[PDB]
DNA sequence: CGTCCGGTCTTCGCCCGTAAATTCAGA
DNA sequence: TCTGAATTTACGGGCGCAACTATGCCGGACG
RNA sequence: GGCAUAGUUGC
């Protein structure tokens, strides 16, 4: 099984899981630990930001690769936006402060 | 399944951990060929429009 | 082709700054304007950058000097057409 | 874009500010047409348009109308991303209690009003009354009333009197509280009260009030008045096959709460009686509780098919929450999966990728190349060309795959080697061909294992893969320095077969001019592969200044050895190929190659050694047959005599001589001896199975037997399995642990009868179940360890400190289990280490103890070395490179930035998931005693009067080869510092009695003793001599329990004897349970016994050690030195008092009576000296002995288990984990800083504060470190995000919101969640830029 | 086929930690 | 008759990762 | 395209 880019989920804009549906492998938590133990920072950011659920990030990455340029815009994952909205659904006020 | 002439010996590392080296005769005779029947269905739902 | 990067890391004993400087060189070779300083042997920009670091003609400082000189040339030539 | 995250309570005004419209109707869709309802949970005018740039009414449908709002249905025409973002709100007809702050355990509302959780729950759920503004009446403020008492008060106190019901009363109580008044009153009560429980309760409540006042939140906001609504797109309804819809749990909960809300509002409109409206409010409260963390009170209300509904808290907590499912690990595009395969032709730096997977993964790159070459103007044309799989696309794929490393990552990535990068090679098929060597790194055999592929895209990612993740750079494991690409099963067998000698083979004895003609001979078949010959060898040694100096000699070896030597690079000595080359020998070969030559020679050597091993293993044809498992024909007599011994033991038993239990033990013993002896006979007959001779006399040789060759080579199998094949397969135990009397007496070559197989399946089923239910504990332990040591990163290059831990060889009691070589390898020295002889600086202070320095250190017989440790590094927010030391994955010092916390956690956790009287001196050496106070008695035997006297067996070079513990009152036949004879026991004592050895000589006068109550009279008839035994306070009579008997020595006149060294008389206060055989008035001597006082696991042990669990029977220690005295008359238990010479005299302790004491009443003990016996509590060790004591204790204890399981991990990882444990310190003296009295603050923070104050004129605040477990250490982190992603999400979020904490996101998990560059590797430069710029 | 509101029977593991209730041991 | 401590009891949280196949489901009761 | 159950594979 393999996947370049296909349909994504709804709640979190992430690739679908499974092969009956044209989905992608799960970069589990220990896999992220394996990268962290390495000096792999850019690879990790590309893995869990551009290739997973950064809509602007993944669109720009796809277009740049089509143009032949291997560069990325990190952006912010949409799964973190989902978490922020879900905590805000409660009485817990979580917001990103101005830099 | 089938039974076939087996020989226990390391062969150039192509059976390293537990891998199995198959002679092309086994493929030629088609003795491990298996028929899989797959069912595909399309539905015509009385949807809007 | 490449198998190791041990010579490049020996020349830049950090193993991480090497990645960043090689990435900068590959970017400069891919956008890119510039051209390889080592005879290209049908290799992608990453291998070219790493080999070119291996030759010892690029590190962070040399690349920074080159970028500064390029910006100076842009300032001068852009100024000549202006005034 | 942002460098911090804050939390705080959500005021109703702020909640309304978030929302863009109220939700009023509990409707979603028509279920006939799919447009959203008017103002339902899925609305358009509230949350946004259903489509993009298309209103609901259809009037406006294009980009030109971006911003305008129609009048017909009021949907603001814009994108749908706002529908994914815009939130709503619900105006609750009544106030509602927030369930987290009600049942967070502790309950915030509970202790903010200082009222029990039961009472607050009763008043919130409309079943109890609470008064407000008590006034001049007979009621308090927080007092609870019932319906009966409420009516009584109404009929008696009809005047102004307020006592409400439900959430309204709680809101009024919270609103009627000012923080400062209560805080000051609580501080005063804390100071004056003097209690220990009330003081803790106060210093908690005061802390809560200070947290509330410090932040911008207010208490009244913990009672909801406007309920936030999640955006519709985050709880979507997905239509199925049919008009039905997928009822998301949040939708059902929201529908229920809004429905009950509208019902309550309607009942309020018509002013229904009190009972109905109270019931409706209770229903609304329950619905809101269900919408929040559902399941705290009552039952999780279910919606369909009797399963609890997911709530928002249940949606952001747990394994299925957004933290551990979509933030810390996410599904990734450009990935694949398939079954793996050997493909032994590959080089170490490449992997075989299937062509179809290559085409599917690199689709964008193929599109880009096609457009760059102009073969397809539009992306649609390129996509169609790729789909049709033309003949030109394959050339494009070949062009792009050239230098594009891919990551291969097996499923359970225990340690960092579980993911590695290879250069793809196009392979026809559908299975990944993975290089054979890395299988050990992946723990991945080829029995159907699957691996995932990942394709880096960016230039930085490609360079990271090439320079960090290629298998070529990962030669040495991070846990230990041993290589992790050691040839595993067939290469090792091939080399073992090649490099061996038999007595005689074809062409034995001929002389050869070099390896080349040796190979030429073997291929032509003139001389066998294993034939002792003489070969001319040219071995290059680099003893010069980096120059390889040739050397030609005539070595006597075999043909196979020479053929192998043709592969070895120049710089290695020939002696590493002159031996049998088992697995360990090959691993040492590769390690030496890495150490001497470098990396490229070792990689080429690995490829070539794999190739030659496979080739000559194939040529050997090393097979296995049933005739190769030779039975020991002589086992007949062994099994017969074992049967005879058990028969004779049964003969003794049936006579009644021996009982059942001892017979059971003896039978097990004799069968164990028989099994061991049969195994030894089999192994001898197998290794010497083959005897070859045709040139004269017989000569034995190591056998060729297939099983023995395949076991000795170390490829697969060991002594246990080979024993089980031929010898009796040993002792198997019932699941209760009772070992069966009659073990399996038949091997596997002969058939196992039914019952033997039944026992074997007991064993195997237990093993499989243990694996399946221990992997869980291993996974939990590794997760906890990683989440503890994640923010720890090597920041500084050298902390510049002169501290360290004295690293010494560790001996459990036998031989040297771990030499100093491996315990001080790759660790920078702390202090200058002098030569053992006389003050010669052998090694400088701050040099990296690499291989040559360590070898020289061993050569000079150096036993004690002090090396800078990670635990004793004073760097702030990280640890300097030098204190950590060697990388253990490369041969150089650790780089500046490489994260070591995660490496240490993974290295510790990997082995967990796989597996987990007489002192008979053995060597000729000197005897020296440390911490000893002995006295020579009449019988010329030495008796020791201390407790921590360890007997060290020193050798001629001064090193200690054996250590043993000498208890109080041990007999030594030799002297101190005098060389003894090895072979016979040196120390003897009774492990069943504790003596009362004296210090002077004289007579025995029992003072302060009265017969009848102080002691009990025993007249033993079988010995004829009575005994004077002292019984305890609760055991002796009530006549003399207030006084303790004293045993004193007198002279011939009757006067007392003074203590030698002090003015006080020498009297011994005997405790109860004392066997004083001597009577009154018997002469004694010095150091003579007067009376006899009679008397874990694998992975769980490691987990308990790391969590710092307090043992059940901890050994009590002495906090401060001084003289020891007893106190009160055992009120609850014995009491102790320790008085220093000029310090805090009244320091006392409370000691149980049922536990035997260790020290007597006339000892001056030092802090950290054991006062009782049992496991030592890590907290006590840290508090008393110090940080170095506790870290050494933890390291030694865990290394004990990990060595007992035959595993090797360097101590750096344990040390850094221990450092992360003791990250919190409690203040004791405020000093001149601003910290409170007993608050717990980060060690680094207090350290920097004290550092700034010392440079100034003020005086810093002294701190007291505290040892925290891994769970508590990770939960109590400065940044809430890490702990929230860890367990206890609800409690951590409640803490952060109540305290209004702020996040700096300086860790690793935290940046991962946020989704930016990690501050560990290549991103460390970016975070350095971040720190520079601000 | 088209709309529309919601609660009897079920427990049943092991370990750890922390907070609440009970009981000593006195004054 | 009160009151602080240590103990006991009650109750809240955790119990690895990755992957594949199948089925059944949004609810059963009023116009 | 999300949940539940069952079974299965590698550890
Ligand atoms: Mg396997
Ligand atoms: Zn409209
Ligand atoms: Zn340091």
XYZ file of C-alpha atoms (C1' of nucleotides) in Angstrom, chain D residues 32 118 204 255 283 1104 1109 1131-1132 1272, chain E residues 3 6-7 16-19 21 25-26:
20
model
C -35.997 15.490 3.944
C -20.562 15.709 49.805
C -3.387 24.316 50.255
C -29.413 18.396 21.902
C -32.112 17.709 34.895
C 9.291 0.857 41.325
C 8.103 3.987 45.664
C 3.006 5.072 73.879
C 1.862 3.510 70.606
C 4.988 13.026 39.518
C -41.912 12.394 12.093
C -34.624 10.134 25.139
C -33.499 7.382 32.857
C -0.916 3.149 43.047
C -1.793 7.669 45.033
C -4.347 11.073 47.606
C -8.209 12.741 50.234
C -13.694 9.182 57.818
C -3.726 8.424 73.015
C -4.102 11.276 75.637
